[PDB]
Homo-oligomer: A and B are copies of this chain.
């Protein structure tokens, strides 16, 4: 219930779930709503690593905006994109402090949801993101995409390889997912699934592309067979909780598999 105070057993690993996605895919919404969902049964904590966001749909236990905001930095005459980078250079000075707060949380909660910088590139190309991720115990990364970017076959290969890239970069199990599935006509929904679920089929459609660019993508589906096999893409809705049971199951499974 909203008023439940769920108990976490102190000598027990929590589940850290980290949401990553380009600006606008629904990171902050998914954290809040997946949080609510879990709160029926679990002790959840919320970490906001995003210095830009104007308002939160959840009460954070940790909030980097308490320390500095993009808006504050822009007051110093920085442009927005400059203020965003500058904001993570400043937080980096306080790295251990935040690393240790997050680690504390992980001892005190069943779940810790991390809502990452609004721009995925801050998290992936700045020292703050990767150094945090190196230092967290088996964090589970949910990489979400707006389905509206899936307009041609090689987009499906794009998203899949980007998740792999994220998994390389952050050194964490990355789950590729779609958000905003609430908006998907069911034809749209089955297309996406077929391309994602049927890599023989995907590969074949990419075979047809005559472009110089098409050949490379068709080829790039070397992912498979001898290592790199396509993992199931999750379909989520942060508005309706479609896929929340899935996500929760996956996150528990990942949790059982780790600590081994």
- Bitwise, A66-104 to B at CB < 8 A (1) or not (0) is 000011001001111111110000000000000000000
Of A74, A78, A146, A211, which is in contact with the most chain B CB atoms at under 10 Å from its CB?
A74
- Bitwise, A136-159 to B at CB < 8 A (1) or not (0) is 000000000010110000110110
Residues of B within 8 A of A148 (CB): 127
Q: How many copies does the complex hold?
A: 2
A196-204, A215-223, A239-247: which lies at the B interface? A215-223
Assess the B118–A79 pair: CB atoms within 8 A: yes
The residues of A with any CB-CB pair to B shorter than 8 Å are 22-24, 50, 52-55, 70-71, 74, 77-85, 118-122, 124-125, 127, 130, 146, 148-149, 154-155, 157-158, 161-162, 164-165, 167-169, 171-172, 211-213, 216-217, 219-220, 222-223, 226-228
- Between A and B, 25 residue pairs with Cβ closer than 8 Å are A22-B121, A22-B125, A23-B84, A23-B85, A24-B81, A24-B85, A53-B81, A70-B79, A80-B83, A130-B149, A158-B168, A158-B169, A161-B168, A164-B216, A164-B220, A167-B213, A167-B216, A168-B216, A216-B227, A219-B227, A219-B228, A220-B223, A220-B228, A223-B223, A223-B228
